[PDB]
Amino acid sequence: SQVEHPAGGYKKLFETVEELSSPLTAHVTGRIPLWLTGSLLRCGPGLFEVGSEPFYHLFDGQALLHKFDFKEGHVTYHRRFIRTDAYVRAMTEKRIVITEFGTCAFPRGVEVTDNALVNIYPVGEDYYACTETNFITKVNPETLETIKQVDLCNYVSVNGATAHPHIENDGTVYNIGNCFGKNFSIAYNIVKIPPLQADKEDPISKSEIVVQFPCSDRFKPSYVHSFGLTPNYIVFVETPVKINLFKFLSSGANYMDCFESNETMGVWLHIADKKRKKYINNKYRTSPFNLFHHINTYEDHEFLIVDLCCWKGFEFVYNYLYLANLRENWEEVKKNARKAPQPEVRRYVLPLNIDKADTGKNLVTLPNTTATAILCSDETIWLEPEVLFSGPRQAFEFPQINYQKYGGKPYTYAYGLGLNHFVPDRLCKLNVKTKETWVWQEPDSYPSEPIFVSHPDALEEDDGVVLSVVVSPGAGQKPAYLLILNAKDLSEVARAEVEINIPVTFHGLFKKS
Amino acid sequence: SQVEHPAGGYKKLFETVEELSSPLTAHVTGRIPLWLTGSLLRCGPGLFEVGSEPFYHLFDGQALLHKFDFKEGHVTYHRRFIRTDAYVRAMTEKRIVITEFGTCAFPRGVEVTDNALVNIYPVGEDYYACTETNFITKVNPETLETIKQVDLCNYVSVNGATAHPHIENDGTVYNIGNCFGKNFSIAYNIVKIPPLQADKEDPISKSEIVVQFPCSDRFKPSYVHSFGLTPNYIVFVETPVKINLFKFLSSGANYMDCFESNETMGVWLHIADKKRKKYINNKYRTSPFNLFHHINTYEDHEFLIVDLCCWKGFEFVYNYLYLANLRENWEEVKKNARKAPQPEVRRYVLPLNIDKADTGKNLVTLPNTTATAILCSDETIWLEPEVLFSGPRQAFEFPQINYQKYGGKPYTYAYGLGLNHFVPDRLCKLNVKTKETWVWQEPDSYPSEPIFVSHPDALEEDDGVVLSVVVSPGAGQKPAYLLILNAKDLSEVARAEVEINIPVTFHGLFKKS
Numbered sequence A, B: 001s002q003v004e005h006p007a008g009g010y011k012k013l014f015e016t017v018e019e020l021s022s023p024l025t026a027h028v029t030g031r032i033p034l035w036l037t038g039s040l041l042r043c044g045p046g047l048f049e050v051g052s053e054p055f056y057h058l059f060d061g062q063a064l065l066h067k068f069d070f071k072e073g074h075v076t077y078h079r080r081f082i083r084t085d086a087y088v089r090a091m092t093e094k095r096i097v098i099t100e101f102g103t104c105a106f107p108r109g110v111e112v113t114d115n116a117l118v119n120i121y122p123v124g125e126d127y128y129a130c131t132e133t134n135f136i137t138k139v140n141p142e143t144l145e146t147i148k149q150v151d152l153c154n155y156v157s158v159n160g161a162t163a164h165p166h167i168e169n170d171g172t173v174y175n176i177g178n179c180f181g182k183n184f185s186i187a188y189n190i191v192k193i194p195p196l197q198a199d200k201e202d203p204i205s206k207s208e209i210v211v212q213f214p215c216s217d218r219f220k221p222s223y224v225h226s227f228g229l230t231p232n233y234i235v236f237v238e239t240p241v242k243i244n245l246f247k248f249l250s251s252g253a254n255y256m257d258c259f260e261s262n263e264t265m266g267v268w269l270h271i272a273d274k275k276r277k278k279y280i281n282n283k284y285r286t287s288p289f290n291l292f293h294h295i296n297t298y299e300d301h302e303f304l305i306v307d308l309c310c311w312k313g314f315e316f317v318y319n320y321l322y323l324a325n326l327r328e329n330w331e332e333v334k335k336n337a338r339k340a341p342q343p344e345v346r347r348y349v350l351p352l353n354i355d356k357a358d359t360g361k362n363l364v365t366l367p368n369t370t371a372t373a374i375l376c377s378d379e380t381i382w383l384e385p386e387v388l389f390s391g392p393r394q395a396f397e398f399p400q401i402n403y404q405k406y407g408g409k410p411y412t413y414a415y416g417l418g419l420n421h422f423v424p425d426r427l428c429k430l431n432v433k434t435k436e437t438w439v440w441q442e443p444d445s446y447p448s449e450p451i452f453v454s455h456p457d458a459l460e461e462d463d464g465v466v467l468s469v470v471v472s473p474g475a476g477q478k479p480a481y482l483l484i485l486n487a488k489d490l491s492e493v494a495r496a497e498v499e500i501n502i503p504v505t506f507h508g509l510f511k512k513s
């Protein structure tokens, strides 16, 4: 179970690469399924230094857009840097011009980064690469050309937005960002972008605030990375990782310098009625953790099931993700993670109906969970999770599901990237009911978030494949490849090898063609 | 996994029986191991009503002492009521005379029960049956005669004592009970009874207070059921189940009426240096749970590993253990448990060395756990467990280990009784490192706490058997039997059937002969 990486091949995930001018034909081993037709689109950093000025953090390198195309069993690979302000101005001036998450730039107002290195998602007929700021970047998903920059503040009152909007079957987009909501107060706004309507105009110009969540601290919003969505409810988790706005507006500093941990609050969970557009005043509380990715959320009788990838503790996990740390040799990478928060997959169960006559008791009356929710006299509901996966410094992270058909609904399976002291080195499948797992790994191979693609005529939940981009440096070996696994048991079906390196990618999607 | 008991045979665990005048030869099926030589001694209630006056709670029925003897593959069974004050006076007066845990008796000073229905343990050359009060009862382990009543208050300043003293290899006994310790204050005392010394006098007359733990509340001690012991440390867990002494001394009421839950404190964990006899001022804190049984505790580098059978929530679990509830039909037993705390086996890891320079970080630097301990600025150490077993209303309870050789030391295996909505219906083995489990169960069979007995030539931790007393009522069937399982995989080795019923038993021991 404890796998070692003494060769240090994971360092290639963080080495600069060049863009291609046209797509590259990939060498196929095994058999690419013939129904797999479309484009795997993924974002990540590709330039980790501008000349002699280095980027310091994992989330600083300049956005590179990757694409693997699949048709009739053949595969191509293409990549282009996103022509953002951050990238363009850095190429023009031959230096780092915009301040990135953990890299301050040396020398009009505050120039917020639009380095869209995190994720890509559809709004209407368009696709937008994003990071976590107010700026998103329209891209062409066939050529990978950078179409335009969009400033979300032109359309709605929010200071940022997550790279994990939820998208319903009709194309309706929901997302969360903090704002200066009320009188002398901070809040978090849920924005809804409708699908493309008859009049064919930009759906973003029809953005609106659906509902607002209160903040635990008047002047300090929590860092929100993702959130939960069901047909009827929105779920938001407020962690003790706080953004100090006073400290940001003072400054030259970077984004990381403005984060702090609130030691006493623990985690507050909030639910809103999605259709009635109304915050529900249920004071759900639990112990402290970092949270980046919701796995999935759904309704079961009068309860919300909330599956989370947690990190136990209140220190901000991103402190362990500086490039210097991740480029260290293996023994030192392990040492660096010794005092880090511990990863754990957790199921929380939130009762929707709080009856006073149950004060002091466990309200989770469901038959198939060990999660609990205690109603206290002060009207807080204290929650304990059911643990679904727990491995020592072995994270099930970057979770993916059969989203289109089981997102926001009762489900059984999640796929994830396994992180070993923060270094990605395996792919995982988790049965969230039985807790059985499947694993894929090979020595000296470092994979990316697995994306699920259904067989188009699937009736079962895991009838399909997962795709992952893998780096595998070494003598007598192709430096990278696209991996295709059978979603049933994570056995290898095919892989598509390329002869150039591919750096780390965070998120992406499969666009059926 | 969800086993049903529509026939309601579990009710026989709570039906009055008669004592025997001499031992009964048991009918053997399979093969009793020839090295198994000695006496299985177990305590439990055997009289659930005095004439027409009923006892109400599981911990009220009058103490019955059971014994299965093993020699050269043959088995006898014997049982006698313990001639306590509670029992004797009830037979004399033809009514309930002493107030039991959940049964008040109708008409100075305060007459505290000596109903020794819980456990039996050795002190020097003697054996004592006990409950949780200041009165313990010397018994003869061969004849099952009741020798004498001992009032612990004659020897040491404590108001009670648990039924789970720890006993070292040399015979030294440690235990915990609360006391009016300091000025205007409550505390908990650790008492040590030495082994039988040269002068041959009663070791109890040489009892002494080793160390004292402070209380979270000035006038309200927590209910303490058991505690942890290693070669060098004592571990005590202070739960939010509190005893209200003011409410007790006011009263006619019973013991149960004086319990309450503190909603805000959570759980406080305390450690004392055993050899230097000194409380260590480390403020370990975690979320609320009920706790009855420590599984085992041990030292690993500079950390205490603390394995616990927990119930998630602060409502007192004993509220669900009234005889009326446990005698209900199956569907109503399940309904009654719907809002109960959820059982969970948990490993906590307590750092012994708290360095201020790690404030805000996880101090658990061990490689093979996901347990964490966060050092806060206010100097509390917040703890999160590693979950070892978690099943919906399915408790791994009444834990036992290879105590003599692995108690207080690094270990791998625990055995337990599986409770299904509080009804015992299976036997379990847990590998505390890998989390693999083994299960024994048969329809309509309701077993007792499994006791481990080692093979004389054992090379490994689980080389031996577990013994359990099982009730199995029904047509064409022996109403009860002693079950012998192989500790390796919990496969059946033998059983020793008797033709009379055997009610529920709580704890006991095997006395090698």
Ligand SMILES: [Fe+2]
Pocket: A163, A164, A225, A292, A293, A507
């Ligand atoms: Fe993310």
Ligand SMILES: [Fe+2]
Pocket: B163, B164, B225, B292, B293, B506, B507
């Ligand atoms: Fe007990």
